[model samples]
Target chain A: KWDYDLRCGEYTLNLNEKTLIMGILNDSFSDGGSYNEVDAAVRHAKEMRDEGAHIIDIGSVEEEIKRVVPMIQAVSKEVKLPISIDTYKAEVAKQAIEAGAHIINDIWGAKAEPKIAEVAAHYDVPIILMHNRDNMNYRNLMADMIADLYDSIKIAKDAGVRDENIILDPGIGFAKTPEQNLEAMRNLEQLNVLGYPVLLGTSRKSFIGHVLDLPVEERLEGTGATVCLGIEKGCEFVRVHDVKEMSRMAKMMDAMIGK
Target chain B: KWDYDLRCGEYTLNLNEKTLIMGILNDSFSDGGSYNEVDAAVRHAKEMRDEGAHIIDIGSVEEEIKRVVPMIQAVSKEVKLPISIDTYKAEVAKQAIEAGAHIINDIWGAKAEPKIAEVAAHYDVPIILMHNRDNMNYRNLMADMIADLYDSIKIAKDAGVRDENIILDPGIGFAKTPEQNLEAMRNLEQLNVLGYPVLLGTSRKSFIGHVLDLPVEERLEGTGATVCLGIEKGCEFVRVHDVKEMSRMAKMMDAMIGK
Candidate 1:
């Protein structure tokens, strides 16, 4: 059991009790929008919170500051759940944290910009460094993935980020083929050897679509399979878009596993 | 891996390829009704078939001949999927097998009526023996349950039932407290040591309600957790009411585990 107590603003998530849900809010991942977009994003955030999400992850496709900063500011006021800025850009990370986001989620595992880890240390908030790279070819799949994550962890720690504040995400759909993705899921428990809470974000990814041959919206069941097995294999958190269903699945899994 | 080749009439389920779904069809469990009941039951059975159910299970509350025979006759014709009559009565078992039901699902483990094992042998069909008893008290929960199942296996083999034609169910809700159900889920792989394909039926059970504090209608995700983790724990078939969702979950688990 990779037990960790993560403090995010006023909220503290104890991984031994539950596999926390980090609901996705990609309003920033879309085109330029009006306040109507802000209202919709805020509504979605509240719905995810009501559906038992422990935290909200907001991401932009382009890592634009203007788009995410205002959305984060609006949703922070409406939904009291801890907010995570899903960006690799140091500027967006800093702005979102100032706008009330509580965690920094870097897709490139802080290799793109180590400043995010410094920002995480300065804010005294947690940072999720996902295993990702441009090269898909590797001598070893899980071993290489684990090694890269070690490099990221060192970067975070070197940047003054606390070991307790570092979270590892095995990038499920990043820099790998569909077969590699399946292998990643099969070998997910190897990440726990890093002694950080592993957060899985395989929600509605292309690998699920590849395996099940279903559309993106039809990937909920596939996501549930990963989430359930992820916890059984010792994951501490799951990031998903279908907050209500995923939260329920996580709750039942936690109940079964005595989380 | 608990590979099983279960032959039910024209259907052959290889447990290595997929974790089969045995969808519920308890038309006989309800009160007396007109042909409308038969129509609705037949519709439900076909729906489960299209929703990817490999087998259909029909049960009567009172073990009456008129209720189940007609329903089985109707469903066996309408749905090409194999029909399983959930009965422990020897007469009902004989009549149902003759009327086109392919399997006998005995909740009593055939200890209530060992003749049902003979019926299973006579029809050359599979039989599912679930762990159930009037006694909830146990000197050893899993050990006693496993011992009772061994006794049932003896009865089946003694009556000429083939080893390849027997399936075991853990009886998740039957004679179990909430904690015991959780323990049963945790220790489910023990049943694999019995060298038989295990079937898990935890759909909308009271233990789920107890753990999640939700009503029967709200236990879909709980059922998904059990189904996903049940497959992870080496269950070969899952008896479920929500065939579509559970089949999707089973398919996803099968995909992830390379079933």
Candidate 2:
């Protein structure tokens, strides 16, 4: 059975049911960032939801606690779908969770701040623990990477987080080289066999640019190539910028596989 | 042994050396057109070549060919690749052949004008005889379609055209319904068994539109899907509008399927 579905927090996403378009709402209010403003972010989030977003990821970095909490609250209030807080900071995670963010996407996988696990447990929200290595050195890259994620799972488990409230992401560009990223994508089924949903964030990543020998804007087709390969490797979620096109691609590909 | 060179007329296409992109330069330049009429078409053709086009298909009715032939001539003179005359009209076919087009694509299989076969034989150009029926009524659709193509092959032979100069297209959307079109595409092996290179053109056609419920503008991914599937089904050539994308798709699929 080629079932493509994933449970993040209280939300169960069925890939075949509809394509999930997630908009990135990075809450760096005080940082003077050029990407998006708070009002603009909320507007974009609302527009993205209307356009077909299933979820909005609210990332807190500029003002982790202050920005994330109010941003998630505003987006949840404005949009019908659930919101995810992307953070590894404990207080920021707790504030966003308390405010209304349904999912916690910790880039460090709560490895840097295990208290983030307590916040997830308190809110009973799903936490996506992405694999990250401190150094590029490895005896066996795949095995070590898998073991690293398992360690994070242990961290979450020990911190009273439920097994059901966990997702895994093999972070494509975090610490690994281009070859390692390719290996991770090619052997993603190994991670999938572990029974947790896999979210791939290879959107406009370095590996795609490296392969295509193209700049960021030119990597859409290459990104699509990887996404297709990722789905073939049993990846459940694909984090992408070109959500509309990617969504259609996912549907057409699923149909072709006859899943 | 896999031979990659395709000798059509005065030009030889080396398919194995690099991925070949064939751009469609529809012939629509007439009634009250500009002196720079073919300028845009020629520019697009040159751009596609720069982006990696190996062949340019110059079709009259689809564009405005009578007004555009001079432009095609200019591009054919400037470009290194083969220029293909895409028409079923004998006079237009003759002029395009004389204007340096190495291939003739008769969508109506010379049924529209039987003298087109004479032009093909005189030009010593390879001709693609696509199966098209005025009547959808068939005792057995596939068998009737094959028989129709056979009749066209006989017409080519009668005109003194060489057997190797003939290619066959199943004609995905000519007179067939969606399901019949699918059957024709899925069963391309039967057509390929006739000892001629089978050209499949499911690109942005009604079958894909029916399946995806998408308009023509958004059918590139679906077109790419059919190209990959066609290659898998042993089709040697794919007639497509999104040539670069399909070129990449074909190359990648060829790598996987090439034993």
Candidate 3:
């Protein structure tokens, strides 16, 4: 039986007694990045799964869509872990869904393209609605940030995405300055009190680097400290690069906090 | 400049506000294994001193006292950092004093040989009386521990050892159960209330492994956790294996606790 009542879209992932470690896999081939290789992509998924990743995020859209599909398909078939399709394109999302993926982790919150939410709803998959705005303008940072997330939730629901299928991400290190990111991390407990499970995506992010004055590889300890801080502030799932270490940290921290 | 008032023997090391790290050099050669090469031993001392070891502990007798004197002499001559002769042997303690070592760290707590207290009195160097008994019996752990230390102090005073030249170590991980170790760690504040600066020697110790279930190599993080806890409990000096990391942990913990 799950101890935590987690509402992520239409799915209530009962994390009452469990700490989830979600691993990130950015699809750079479609994004015209030099770091894209199909063999490496699938390997990333399998490796993260082996290292205790609860979910593998398949990032997409700036790559050769057809080539990326086979890789995601191969990863889905090869790994026993849940696969997340991280894309704003409905076609790519559809292909990923057919390839045994479980979640639609749209960075655009389906606001970039409404059809993405329709595709997630059609497949009965959960969609993660992360907060993003056109500008840095905010009447009040916290209130505006919450309102942005609420808007995304509305957009998903309007497109036939169930309320339980909606997960809110505060989108730290995304469109926010270092101070704002820290402020978001500091106040995440309030977001958890809003009755939705919050996913913290601060793994080796720029804000942490800014604060710690460290490079990406050296940011693990600093990031681990932030992850502990995030858990202390009531975040459940931490999206991180180093799955094994972060998973161990989250588990130990959860044990100490009794949550 | 340093912040705390540290009384080591007749010398009161009062600083404007800097933390200190002490490195442990357990002499293995005299007991069984050999000491590091003479040049390497000197280099190690210099390296630690460069890396911020305020004091370097030359632990003899753990390996073999016969082989440790030359090693301590070589390192003491090579570095300006104060060298602590960690031994209970009166002759070795006297030899270290003749060679210009600054302090005598008697793990035997002067109970093994009261003459060691005489050596400290004769040399007028600081004597760290560590609390240790062959048996692990206690009516009240902290109270009994203090009484045992008081007996050691009385022995030192009886031998003409200056009162100002005495330091106390509760001897964590020595002659205590795991729970007792934790209790001692928690009750360090009370130990601090005893009106003497306390030296904590918990670096990579078994009690840390017991609490975290981490192996020796992996216990640094857990050790850091304990050091943080110890500092929170008002420990003045920490004898550690990983000096740099523990120093950082101490500084950060102090910063958070407003030290």
Task: State the local distance difference test value for candidate 3.
Answer: 0.72
Q: What tens digits encode model 3's per-residue C-alpha lDDT throughout B52-156?
A: 578889864533455566777777677777778888888888877776678899998899989999999987887889999998889999998999998998999
TM-score of each: 0.94, 0.73, 0.64
TM-score of chain B of each: 0.94, 0.90, 0.88
Best by TM-score: 1
Relative to the unseen true structure, what is the C-alpha lDDT of residue A91 in candidate 1, on a scale of 0 to 100? 79
Candidate rank order under TM-score: 1, 2, 3
For model 1, the DockQ equals: 0.75
Candidate 2 local lDDT, B1-259, one digit each (tens)? 1254567665786544433456776423345245565677777787777765678887635344556468667888877778887788888887776767788999999888999999999878889999997878888888888899999998999998887788788988999987777677656678866777777777777777777789998888667756655665667677777766766555544433441
| Model 2 steric clash pairs | B27-B59, B27-B63, B27-B64, B27-B65, B28-B63, B28-B64, B29-B64
**Tens-place lDDT digits, model 1, residues A1-259:** 5445888878888878788899998544566556778888988998889988989999853537778888898988988888999889887898899989998899999999888788888999999999999989899999999999999998989899998899999999999999999888888888878889999999999998887889998998889999999999999889999999898899889888877
RMSD of 1: 2.6
- Candidate 2 vs candidate 3: the TM-score winner is 2
